Amino acid sequence: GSSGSSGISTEEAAPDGPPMDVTLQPVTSQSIQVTWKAPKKELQNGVIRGYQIGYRENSPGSNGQYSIVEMKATGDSEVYTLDNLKKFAQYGVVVQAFNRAGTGPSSSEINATTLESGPSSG
Structure with missing residues (x-):
């Protein structure tokens, strides 16, 4: 409990x-x-608290479970440097906007x- 919300x-x-x-x-x-970038304007359904970046190897033998990473919405545009990856390997990750009201689709x-x-x- 540090910053509230008014808008x-x-x-x-x-x-x-x-x-x-x-x-x-x-x-x-x-x-x-x-x-x-910010998910639409009308869909935004209010400000965003943060988004989830789930990434996982694109090959067999990987943990599997999409490694979720919690973050905060710096502004309209957001970015996240997913480290701890493989070398020259295919990787699939998803992005979803999650707020206090709940989470959305990927x-x-x-x-x-x-x-x-x-x-x-x-």
Whole structure:
């Protein structure tokens, strides 16, 4: 209990739609960048407390269960660098907006095969 909520809304509601601009982007070798935008405006169903980024290997032998990661909505646009990944391997993650009112549906499962090498300045 630190910050309340005031914005013509005495009660929020779970999102009835996934986030937009949902896409992956390999920045390193064992990590990927997930960027997305606010889920619609009318669907937003009130401000958002945060979203869930579930990612899991795209191969057999992986834990399986989509590793969920709780975060906060910095603003309209949000991003999350999913680290602890494999090397040059396909990975599928989803993004969903979750508020105090509840959680919403996920976004079209995307993918992004991590780079085939480590990072390099330039």
